[PDB]
Structures are given as structure tokens and as C-alpha cells.
Amino acid sequence: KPLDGVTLTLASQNDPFGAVLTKLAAEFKQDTGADLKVEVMDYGTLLTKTTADFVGKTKGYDLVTMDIVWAGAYQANGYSVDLTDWVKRDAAELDLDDIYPVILQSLGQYKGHYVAFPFAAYANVLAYRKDLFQAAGLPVPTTVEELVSDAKKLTDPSKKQYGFVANGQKGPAVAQDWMQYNNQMGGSILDNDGKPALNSPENVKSLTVYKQLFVETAPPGAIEYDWGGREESFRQGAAAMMQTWSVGAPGYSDPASSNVVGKVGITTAPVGKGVPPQYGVGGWGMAINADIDPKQKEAAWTFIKWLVSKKIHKEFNMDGAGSFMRKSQMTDPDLTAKFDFLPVVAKTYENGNGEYRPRIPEYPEIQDILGSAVNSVLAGAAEPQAALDEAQVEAKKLF
């Protein structure tokens, strides 16, 4: 087989695709003879360890799962192979027309160059407990104000029942969840010239309402949750509503992992007044480390093409990757039977906003700064105005 004797080392975010990539290693070795070693890490550790590998030119990782919001940093620093030529050369293998253009562009490209190739696309959705809403006589929320109101109505500590959950963990997790909320109210963290605007009066008001919501309606231990932690909370039955990525939805219908099978609805994220549908897109691309040997680059690209092929990518998603990205997947009889929320995913990608969160080179640093600020506010250590003022000062140093 062509890749006999080859080892590929892949650094992966600990989203559901980390375990699925680990599982698919066997089939990849059966198909190509290559040994795929997947190292799954949490978001911060992943970013730290792979950035150090790039900077040191040490060639420890051949393949890295690159977050959409890292695309500008990857392009500016040349961390990854520019895949533009190979995408064009091998397009017929990739069935590009069957990948939504917003996904190819936003998860793969920056400034017209492929720094990665999309392998896991996420739609921003509201997950809610159908049973709890029905019992309470409440309609499906469509406005962020409904979310606040319903979250309070559905909080009753006496039954260990919380109306709402979101991330509290310092850093990217807490930052991203506040950013999502702010986006749905038409807010931003950059001004119209792309410069930091973390502490605008709108954002201070937004964070003030968000803090009140978090303190009043989320499980008390939510101050420590990252994405996986709040997904687990929701699956366990603890919270009535959660704004999340579609990646979490396979888990809700898994009886081995879920106390809410049959109980969860998936809809578009609610919006503030005057705000049009936000169809937020996120996810991860697969990058090849620019430092590795030519034969390692060739093998890594062979792996990428294998993974995104219709056959394997369907298997990937039937195994729970929650990473749907192909038009063909949205009408596929098996995928639609297993995952009845794909109409919402498809509508999101058809209208997708691949700039739902910034992808500029400064963003990963902004994200960490904002994460410290929002966590200090949710923990009761700093007030919204002072915290965002401080964050703005630090963010401006990057420009």
C-alpha cells in the first residue's frame, strides 16, 4: 500500500471529532498502510503545543486541527502548507461543488490562500428542552429577550432545574459564549475599521445583562464549564436552553450518553430587536505543518483527501463527529434519519456567516484577553465596565 512505513501525527481539538479521528485511524491504515497517531487536547493546550511546534520548527505534528478563527494567524505566520495548488490539482477527488462555498472559504482560506482544508463545519443553534417548554406552556424562543425571560421562568433550584447554561471557563470558552450572545443582539467586538471595540457602551450593557442571566439561571458550577462541560450538563438534563454549535446535537440522542433523548429541539439562535437572522458558521480545518518533510506533506494531504471524501466523511458523521459540511449530507437518507436537525444546519450553511467571529491574525490574542475579562465578571471579581475597559487597553496594544 502507498503509505506503508509512514507515520502521521495529528494534533486535534477535544471536540467529538477527536475520538472519531482516533477511531478512523484503523480504516486509514487499512486503506493506505499509514499509521495515524491522533493526540487529542483541549483548546488552550492544543494552541500552545502546536504553536510551540511551529515556532521551534520541530516537525512534531504533521496535521493540526485549525480553528476557523485562527485562519488569519496561520496565514500571517506561514505555519501551514499553502494548499491552493493541491486543491486545484486534486479538485476532482474532493468534490468541491458538494462543499458549501462559505465553508471552503471560511474554514480553509485567508486572503485567497488555502491554509487548511475544511473537515468539520458547525452551525450556531439554540438547543432547548421541548418537554420543559411544553409543560410550562412556553413557545419556542425567537428573541433574546424571550431567552432571558424563559430562562428565569424555567429556573427552580428546588428541582435542581436551571433555565440556562453557558461557559464560564477563563479564556476562549467564556469569551466565545459571550461573543455569541453579543452577536445575536447585533453587537461586535471590533469597530467598522476592524479595530478593537471591546468596551463599547453596547458591549458593557450586553455583558451586564449576560452576567445577571448567568448568575440567576445557570447551574452554580457553570463558572468552570467549557463547551464540553456545558454540553454534558445539558445532556444530563440540568438546563432548559443552551446556545451552542450543532456539533453537540448528536450527543443528545445517544441513549448511552444522554438523559434527554427525545427531549431536545434545535432551532436558529434567537435574535435581538431589529437583528436579522444570524446564521453563524464555525468549525475546523485540517492544516499541514509547513516544516515537515515533503513525503510527510504528501501523506498528510492524502489523509485529508481521504477524510473529506463523501464516503469517509459520511462515516465520520454517522460515528458522531457532528461535523456535517457537504450539501449531499443534508439530503442523505441515513444522515437525516439519525440526525433530524439537519434542516436547521442546511439553512444555516445556505445563508452562512463565515465571519460570525473574527478570523484576523490578532484574534487569538484578543480572545484570551476577552476571556480573562468575562470570567472575572461572571466570577464576581470585576464589574463589566472596568473589566472591558481593561481588556480594551490590552487589545489595543496589538494594533
Ligand X SMILES: OC[C@@H](O)[C@@H](O)[C@@H](O)CO
In this chain, which stretch among 64-72, 152-160, 257-265, 288-296 interacts with ligand X, using CB under 6 A? 64-72
How many residues touch ligand X (CB under 6 A)?
Answer: 12
Q: How far is the CB of 178 from ligand X (least distance, A)?
A: 12
In this chain, which stretch among 63-71, 216-224, 304-312, 380-388 interacts with ligand X, using CB under 6 A? 63-71
Q: How far is the CB of 183 from ligand X (least distance, A)?
A: 13
In this chain, which stretch among 61-69, 131-139, 307-315, 372-380 interacts with ligand X, using CB under 6 A? 61-69
Asked if residue 42 binds ligand X (CB under 6 A), the reply is no
- Over 265-326, what HEC string results? EEEECCECCCCCCCCEEEEEEEEEECCCCHHHHHHHHHHHHHHHCHHHHHHHHHCCCCCCCE
In this chain, which stretch among 23-31, 66-74, 185-193, 200-208 interacts with ligand X, using CB under 6 A? 66-74
Residue from 163, 187, 283, 352 binding ligand X (CB under 6 A):
283
Environment class of 275 (CB within 10 Å of its CB; exposed 0-12, middle 13-18, buried 19+): middle
List the one residue out of 210, 232, 212, 207 whose CA is nearest residue 221. 232
Residues 205-244, mask of contacts with ligand X (x by CB under 6 A):
----------------------x-----------------
Cell of 50: 502546536
Q: Is 209 helix (H, G, I), strand (E, B) or coil?
A: helix
User: Which residues, at least 6 apart from 137, have a Cβ–Cβ distance to it below 8 Å?
Assistant: none
Q: How far is the CB of 239 from ligand X (least distance, A)?
A: 17
In contact, 89 and 305? CB cutoff 8 Å: no
Residue from 46, 68, 104, 286 binding ligand X (CB under 6 A):
68
DSSP 138: P
Which C-beta is closer to ligand X: that of 15 or that of 368?
15
Which C-beta is closer to ligand X: that of 67 or that of 150?
67
Residue from 9, 11, 15, 99 binding ligand X (CB under 6 A):
15
In this chain, which stretch among 62-70, 184-192, 298-306, 341-349 interacts with ligand X, using CB under 6 A? 62-70
Residues 312, 318, 319, 325: what is their CA dihedral angle, to the nearest 10 degrees? 60
Determine the Cα angle at 391 with ends 386 and 395, to 5°. 150
Which C-beta is closer to ligand X: that of 245 or that of 339?
245
In this chain, which stretch among 65-73, 81-89, 300-308, 328-336 interacts with ligand X, using CB under 6 A? 65-73
In contact, 130 and 242? CB cutoff 8 Å: no
Distance of CA 283 to the CA centre of its chain: 5
C-alpha to C-alpha distances, 255 to 16, 111, 141, nearest whole angstrom? 16, 44, 26
C-alpha to C-alpha distances, 226 to 40, 77, 141, 168, 326, nearest whole angstrom? 16, 28, 24, 7, 28
Q: How far is the CB of 223 from ligand X (least distance, A)?
A: 18
Q: How far is the CB of 14 from ligand X (least distance, A)?
A: 8
Asked if residue 124 binds ligand X (CB under 6 A), the reply is no
Residues lying near ligand X in the complex (CB under 6 A): 13, 15, 67-69, 122, 176, 227, 245, 247, 282-283
